[PDB]
Amino acid sequence: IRLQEDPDPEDENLYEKNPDSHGYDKDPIVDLWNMRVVFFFGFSIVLVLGSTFVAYLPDYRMQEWARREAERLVKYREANGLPLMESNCFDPNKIQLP
Amino acid sequence: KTLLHKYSDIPEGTECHRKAYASTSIGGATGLIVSAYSIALKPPASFLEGVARTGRYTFTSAAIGAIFGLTSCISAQVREKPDDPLNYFIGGCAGGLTLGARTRSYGIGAAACAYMGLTAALVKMGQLEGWQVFAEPKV
Amino acid sequence: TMMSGRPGRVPLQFLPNEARSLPPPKLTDPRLVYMGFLGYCSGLIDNAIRRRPVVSAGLHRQLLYVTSFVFFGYYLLKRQDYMYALRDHDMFAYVKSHPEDFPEKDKKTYGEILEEFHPVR
Amino acid sequence: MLKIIIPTTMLLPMTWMSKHNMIWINATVHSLLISLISLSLLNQLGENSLNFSLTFFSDSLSAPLLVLTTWLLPLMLMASQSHLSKETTTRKKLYITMLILLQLFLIMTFTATELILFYILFEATLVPTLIIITRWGNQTERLNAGLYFLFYTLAGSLPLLVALVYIQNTTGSLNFLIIHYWSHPLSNSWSNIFMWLACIMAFMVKMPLYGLHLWLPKAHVEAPIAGSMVLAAVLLKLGGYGMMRITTILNPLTNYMAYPFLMLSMWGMIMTSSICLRQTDLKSLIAYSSVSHMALVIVAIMIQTPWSFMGATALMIAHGLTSSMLFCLANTNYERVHSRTMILARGLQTLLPLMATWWLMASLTNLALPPSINLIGELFIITASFSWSNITIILMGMNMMITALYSLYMLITTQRGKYTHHINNIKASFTRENALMALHILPLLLLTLNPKMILGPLY
Amino acid sequence: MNPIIYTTLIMTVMSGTMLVMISSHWLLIWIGFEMNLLAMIPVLMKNFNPRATEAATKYFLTQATASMMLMMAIIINLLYSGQWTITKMFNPVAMTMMTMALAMKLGLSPFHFWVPEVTQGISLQAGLLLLTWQKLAPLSVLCQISQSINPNLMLTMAMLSILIGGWGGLNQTQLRKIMAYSSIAHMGWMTAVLPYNTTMTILNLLIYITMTLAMFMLLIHSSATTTLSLSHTWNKMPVITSLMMVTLLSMGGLPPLSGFMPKWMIIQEMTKNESIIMPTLMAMTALLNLYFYMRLAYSSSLTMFPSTNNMKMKWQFEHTKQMKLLPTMIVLSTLVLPMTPALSSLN
Amino acid sequence: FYIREPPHGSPDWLKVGLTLGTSVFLWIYLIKQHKEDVLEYKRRNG
Amino acid sequence: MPLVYMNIIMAFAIALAGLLMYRSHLMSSLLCLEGMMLSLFIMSTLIILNTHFTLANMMPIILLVFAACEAALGLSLLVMVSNTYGTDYVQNLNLLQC
Amino acid sequence: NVLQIVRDHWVHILVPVGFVFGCYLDRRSDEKLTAFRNKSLLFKRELRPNEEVTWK
Amino acid sequence: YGPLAFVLGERTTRKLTETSKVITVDGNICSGKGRLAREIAEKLGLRHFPEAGIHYADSTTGDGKPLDVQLSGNCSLEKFYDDPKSNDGNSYRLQSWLYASRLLQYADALEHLLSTGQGVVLERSIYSDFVFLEAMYRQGFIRKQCVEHYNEVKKVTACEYLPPHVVVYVDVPVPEIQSRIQKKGNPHEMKITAAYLQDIENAYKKTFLPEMSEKCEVLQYSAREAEDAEKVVEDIEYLKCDKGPWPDQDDRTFHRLRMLVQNKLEVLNYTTIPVYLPEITIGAHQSDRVFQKFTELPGRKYSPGYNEDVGDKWIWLK
Amino acid sequence: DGPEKNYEKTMAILQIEAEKAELRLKELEVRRLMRARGDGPWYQYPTIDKALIDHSPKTTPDN
């Protein structure tokens, strides 16, 4: 019904031309350098350096700060006989009920 | 607009016969307009054929309106909840079933039930909540 | 509608003399830079349509595109700023002239106001 | 945020002006560097969001998604290299440009501070995804899948645009900070009910909801590998992000209006996990599993509890990674055997051993083997639902069982049994494919050690 | 037609539009419309075909009826007010008649039946003139008389226009008819905001004119009047079809393209006036236009249709004539969204 | 190379000169206008 | 309004209905257009004469001038239609559809 | 062979220059939003000697 | 040329003279028409266009050297001679491509005549190309649908251009033509069947000669008479064809025709009509491959004058 | 950078956005009132100019 080129055979294995293909391209030099770029800049840099960066990220979430403040409050309240946690979040006097 | 005023003036859930008559009048008017447009755009072969098409469209529209009004008002009475949109939904689905019967097709009936009932419920909600299909320019 | 009938509006004037009071748009404005980017894209599309080298051919033509777009954009930005400034001027003047329509409201602190709590249970 | 945005934009001129040999290499390198830059956003002040500017802000919800997108771009390039090799240089550059535009749009969507800008960028993602699917798909059904995807999403979105404009008119601002701080409660009126529906439905469509999920199987099956990766990992998560953001406005009505979507999602998770049991196409099975997990996420969002939100964020990230990896693993087999039928290729463990291990790890994450972030999110969601109703455990446990069954059934059928005798084109797995699978798996396993990063703002 | 005569006729059309847009007297506005019709009729038939003559006849009949109705409305307003100035119209029946006439001139449904036939009959360039320049004068007159307009009638016509323009295009395989129906839909969008904010109508008109100019110039460049003829263009000039795909996406209204801004601002303005159902229905119905736009895009650029052997000869030669404004038109149609706040200049 | 002389052939130095000069004039005019407007703004607003 | 205004507006309505209801010939519909123009002339003249709008007694003449222009256009189109089809029948303007 | 290396591998300068430019523009935007630099009710302090801004 | 030039007063009629004429020398295969055409062009001082071939457009574009068959033509005359009824569809591809080439050549000849005023002599033309198509259809080489496609293309395209003033037919009897083909010795040509040549002659005499004679006069010469080129030129010099289109044509029609002829793509617009005949329809993949190959050809990537590979310079300012 | 930077920048951003929201609502109200009343610069639709009227003595006294 049409003049069309025969379906191309399964794309030639990159191994046949280069047994150590590494994929990534037909040309072996670009294959090697593509593999090196991927491995370096992801595994060596992003995963390892990035994982270290995340692991030692400064605690701006204030978890240690919260713990220290809670310790101070617990010690003070227990020493003074005040209840450990007050039931009212905000002081009742300031609130004007209807 | 007088027909719309007639339908609105009758209190919801009351005087079911008058409400059904108003709905039938509205359906008949809409059917007449549709028949006029159909006759103009798609010409009828004979005057008798044009009359037949007008009668068919007008009766279908009037039956839809009458069933919608009758079912909605009766449901409002029996449930005794006047402002509930579910009554309008039931009326709309009944109208869709009537359309399916007139077209002698189950699929038309079911699709019409769903869409028309939802549209009628939306119209009742617009009545209750004051929704404006056409809004006066106020900016 | 709206500003079309504003009193004192000279017909078919792009920028009234009143606008000169407003600060001129900075030549490094992001909007003007985007207009220049549009000009550059126009030059590239022209080269593509005429099947010339897209990014290297017709540097004079691309320069003309960018310059024309920036030149028109400067005045367009100036007019836009003038129009918005006129809107703000008229709005504030109207608020001042009609104090009753825009009444100052008593400020109640959250302690005084009662807002119902809906538990997420 | 321009530290990330501007380099992503510069990616396009680099790709267009790069040499024909070096397009993939440059794109991958600079995308990886951009991802490295994005890791700075993970440092989030607990109390307040990182308000970089009027336009852009980041929180403990947006940060993980931004990192995920920046990470996904290089994996997408690596995966897409193989099947686009024959394509001309201009077409390859256009494909890369579509991917880069998609990343730029997604980042701006996640960091945008205004709901209208979020809407513009969130809808804008349709164009590059539609172009990718309908121009670089390999089947005649790519066009119909594109039509379904586009129209489902747009029909959902447009009432959202109307609702957002109405909110801008009434409240006076669409900035998320102001909306959160003021956030007057909604009233139970039909108008407010329909506003709630308009706000929710677009994200409900984006996150495949049972009854609105039909687009997802067609699009994922018919799309190219990169498009499937983005759709599964990030594009679905846009719905969750928006729904978590948008829920602030609709406070009280959410309890009344949640029940239809809650029931639909809870039963649909079982239905789709069962569907996966009897699917005959690997990509379709993966897509339906995605649907089930996103149903879990939808339940978490609707319940509107802190633990549910933390689980939703963790599940979003974990599922994005796991589903992308599964799609890539299926794509390798498709390239080798040129069919998506599960039965056709069998016993691949003998032929390709390491890919078998990749499959095993991906399936284990899919079935939520602890201490995977998938399990953390699912467990938190399950506990929140148990608080919502103790009866919820039955459906959720049944879904867990069905998920394990279908994941291990896929693994057994594809990677176990006797090798298909006639198939002779199986060749040793390339370093690229294994590297892609490892890049998928390792971040997911590592994220378990520090799970506060993917646990969201409520943490 | 001698090129001097053609220049004179086109200038006459533009001068009639200018008289409509420059005159404060109703008589002179009607005179401008009449001059526009007189000049336009020969322009539509510049290439002589039976189809061109049929299109010219249909256009003449419709526009003459519209002009007679407009003159009757003017005379009635004069009878009840004694004023010739273009201003509030003091008689409701005259306002209804004038709205009907101006809608018929604009092709707003239920007066749309002529637009696709005329557009198909005439050439692509005459189609561009018909669907971009001719729209200006009736919209200008409507903008000047917006206050008197009954919002219900204009909104009904706009909604019907949107619906019909969307529906008809789905069934069309001819590019010119597709453009005509899309023009109907976009004109329905423009007139929807006329009761509320005229500046939005002006903005939509400008965006629509830019997009329609880009589309018609691209079709002229590709010399395609049918979908199949456009399908071959990928083999000869791929860039043209790619830009056509971008422009079609903008026409559909997809963000981030410039087609989005007019719909966005129209929805905003309608919502400010408490109009919620109408904007929602208008936005949803716009999806059909998107559907046939996407089908055209699939045929043209996204999918590669079969070509013919004789195209190999066409590869060697290059397009002789250059449309200077086409690249700027494409750029404006597709990449102007980041500059919406500038909608206060025409303000 | 081409048997028929290319229509563009060598550069149209008149056209190139006119284009570049128009660009230069537009830029110089824009810069002068910006300076004038800055002066006017400072003058009128002190 | 006196009854003469009623009659003239009725004449315009009748001519409009005639033009909008074609039968076969195009000449008849062009005659209905000319009738509409005549009715408009009569209405305008009556209004301008009753209101002694002196500088508006020229408007009817301009209306007539452009009415004749329109008539000339109509006839020049009818001649081409007749040449291409052999009759002035409207049913032959059927090539363009929708 | 440097002329050759840079002529065909200059594209690798675009994205890092983008990062630099992005940092610059972000600092400019931080300049824009300085209104309450030290006017808060929580971090408001007296500028330590030899200091003009708390960079907030 | 442009509308602005015509407005200024660039008029074709003034340049045209008695010499300004289109002469088409037609005949059967190996009829000697080329020799007479060349002699007529030389004696009457008219530009001679050699008969259009598969690669005429290649001659008129770019370097002018013939391009590869895949890139230009995808058809072989040798294949047609060896395998007239091939399933590839080569016969109708060749016929349609030849009609396209002859249409382009006629457009170029008309452009030369209307720009410079010098007459043009053509070996066969678009008006005579149907002779081969009819012979192919009669012999069964091509299907009826191919003939219908050819008719559609010719109807849409040929009407625009003006027919030639003088038609010269050199008549050689078919058996003598067979002996001539044997003497020439081309292996593929020798395979030509006698019936095919007879049908070529039948088409010429029954249809082409009468239809052409209706518009103007046709000079029919035998082979011996054709050899005396001077007598033919004198016969042409003393022709008076007042009847016919060219006397009718005025400056407006000449402006339209010159505008059409200058734009080659417009000339060839309807040669690519979307009629999906299997013979001339090329699949998407093969089309993409061949178009990419054509683009990679030197001097073809960009518009003429902007291809740096072939030595173009000053592109940045061009 | 220190938390104070983000704290202060958030405060500034909030002030800017709240001012913009209040101004938007005020603009809406102002436009509504001007359109309803016609007593402001906006929505001032044209009226006939009194300069056009001729006040010279007419043909008849009673005018």
Side-chain angles (χ1 to χ4, degrees), chain E residues 1-4 223 228 232 234-236 304 306-320, chain I residues 6 57-58 61 70-71 73 93 97 101 104 252 263 265 269 271-272 276 280 282 284 287 290-291 303:
Chain E
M1 193 172 307
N2 189 284
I4 312 176
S223 67
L228 264 50
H232 291 15
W234 75 269
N235 218 15
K236 177 177 178 56
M304 290 155 40
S307 72
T308 51
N309 186 26
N310 296 23
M311 286 241 59
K312 297 182 177 58
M313 212 173 187
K314 302 197 66 175
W315 295 345
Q316 315 189 17
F317 303 89
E318 243 274 281
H319 226 243
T320 59
Chain I
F6 190 86
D58 314 8
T61 56
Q70 304 178 4
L71 304 164
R93 277 201 309 278
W97 187 268
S101 301
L104 185 76
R252 272 250 35 79
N263 192 348
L265 294 179
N269 178 31
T271 65
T272 56
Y276 292 132
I280 47 92
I282 306 303
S287 300
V290 177
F291 185 59
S303 53

Side-chain angles (χ1 to χ4, degrees), chain E residues 214-245:
Chain E
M215 275 292 301
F216 269 103
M217 282 188 287
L218 283 169
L219 296 180
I220 299 173
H221 193 288
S222 59
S223 67
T225 68
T226 63
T227 46
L228 264 50
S229 61
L230 189 58
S231 76
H232 291 15
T233 59
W234 75 269
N235 218 15
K236 177 177 178 56
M237 312 158 303
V239 186
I240 276 59
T241 188
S242 173
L243 305 168
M244 264 203 54
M245 186 252 302

Side-chain angles (χ1 to χ4, degrees), chain E residues 2-156:
Chain E
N2 189 284
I4 312 176
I5 284 66
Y6 190 75
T7 62
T8 54
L9 296 184
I10 292 297
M11 290 191 304
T12 302
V13 168
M14 298 189 296
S15 63
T17 45
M18 301 307 305
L19 241 191
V20 168
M21 300 169 61
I22 256 70
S23 166
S24 62
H25 196 280
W26 270 120
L27 173 60
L28 274 181
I29 289 195
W30 177 81
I31 292 183
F33 284 115
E34 286 279 334
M35 292 195 309
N36 257 87
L37 181 62
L38 294 172
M40 260 285 292
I41 293 302
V43 170
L44 295 184
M45 306 182 309
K46 179 189 172 184
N47 319 336
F48 189 82
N49 328 315
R51 297 181 119 88
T53 71
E54 163 176 351
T57 55
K58 293 181 176 177
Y59 186 70
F60 165 77
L61 291 173
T62 60
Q63 302 294 316
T65 73
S67 66
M68 304 310 300
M69 298 175 53
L70 184 73
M71 197 42 138
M72 189 65 245
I74 300 177
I75 291 179
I76 290 174
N77 195 37
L78 173 73
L79 191 279
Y80 273 89
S81 67
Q83 300 297 322
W84 291 96
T85 318
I86 290 77
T87 38
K88 190 69 157 302
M89 299 256 300
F90 298 102
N91 194 263
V93 172
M95 257 311 304
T96 54
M97 193 86 62
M98 177 158 301
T99 304
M100 311 301 291
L102 287 171
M104 200 185 319
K105 283 183 162 301
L106 279 180
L108 296 179
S109 57
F111 304 113
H112 71 286
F113 300 101
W114 62 269
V115 196
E117 311 164 350
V118 182
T119 308
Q120 182 64 22
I122 60 180
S123 65
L124 294 166
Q125 319 152 2
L128 185 53
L129 190 74
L130 173 63
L131 294 191
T132 64
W133 184 265
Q134 291 297 122
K135 307 292 183 177
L136 270 157
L139 266 186
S140 136
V141 172
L142 284 177
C143 291
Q144 303 184 40
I145 71 174
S146 65
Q147 180 182 9
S148 63
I149 297 179
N150 192 11
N152 299 21
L153 173 50
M154 188 66 59
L155 289 165
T156 56

